Amino acid sequence: SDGKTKTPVVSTYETFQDGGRAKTINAIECPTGLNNRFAAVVSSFSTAGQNANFSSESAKDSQGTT
Amino acid sequence: SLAQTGEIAMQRDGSVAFLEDSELCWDTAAGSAKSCLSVRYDTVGNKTELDLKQIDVVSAKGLSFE
């Protein structure tokens, strides 16, 4: 695409696990001569902080702000 | 003396394999411009590549990758 070689973008639904620790996601294995890219985009959110469970794609549990 | 050269005929049963780095080409309406493709190996990658970069666009119906 415009002189640069690219692989198709692949998508995953991610939430942080409770405990406020960073989320580990494994990088895809790139063909020889290409480098890894990543992007996170906003889907659902509230100001609940730790009092929530958004891990279901079909519903969102939001218990309010601490 | 016979010499098994590149002249060996490709069979419709596929029992005969192409030679390394040989190119399968099409006559195109560009006149005498050939639009080729091949299966190359990059030892500096240990990966097999199906190189279509001589063809401008590849148009598929369904398409899947891993």
Side-chain angles (χ1 to χ4, degrees), chain B residues 12-36:
Chain B
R12 73 169 179 176
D13 61 12
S15 58
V16 182
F18 272 139
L19 296 176
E20 298 183 359
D21 264 71
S22 57
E23 296 185 327
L24 163 59
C25 302
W26 259 252
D27 280 339
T28 51
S32 67
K34 232 153 57 166
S35 287
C36 307

Side-chain angles (χ1 to χ4, degrees), chain A:
Chain A
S1 192
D2 289 352
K4 300 297 187 174
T5 303
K6 301 174 173 287
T7 65
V9 311
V10 297
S11 38
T12 53
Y13 188 95
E14 301 283 350
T15 62
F16 289 86
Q17 59 174 353
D18 69 322
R21 290 187 78 87
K23 176 68 187 179
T24 48
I25 302 168
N26 292 315
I28 58 178
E29 191 151 338
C30 286
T32 80
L34 307 182
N35 306 320
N36 286 87
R37 289 298 306 278
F38 184 94
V41 299
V42 176
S43 173
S44 305
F45 65 94
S46 83
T47 53
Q50 293 300 119
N51 313 308
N53 194 347
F54 280 27
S55 62
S56 180
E57 294 181 356
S58 50
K60 302 302 177 292
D61 177 21
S62 198
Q63 293 159 0
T65 308
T66 300

Side-chain angles (χ1 to χ4, degrees), chain B:
Chain B
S1 292
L2 289 179
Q4 298 280 293
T5 71
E7 284 201 83
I8 297 290
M10 280 299 253
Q11 293 289 296
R12 73 169 179 176
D13 61 12
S15 58
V16 182
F18 272 139
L19 296 176
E20 298 183 359
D21 264 71
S22 57
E23 296 185 327
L24 163 59
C25 302
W26 259 252
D27 280 339
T28 51
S32 67
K34 232 153 57 166
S35 287
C36 307
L37 45 101
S38 63
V39 174
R40 312 178 190 280
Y41 175 75
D42 293 301
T43 187
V44 287
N46 200 344
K47 281 309 164 50
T48 60
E49 168 179 291
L50 176 52
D51 183 5
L52 318 177
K53 297 194 288 294
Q54 276 182 253
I55 315 179
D56 294 313
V57 165
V58 187
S59 174
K61 193 151 173 293
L63 166 54
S64 85
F65 61 100
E66 287 181 16

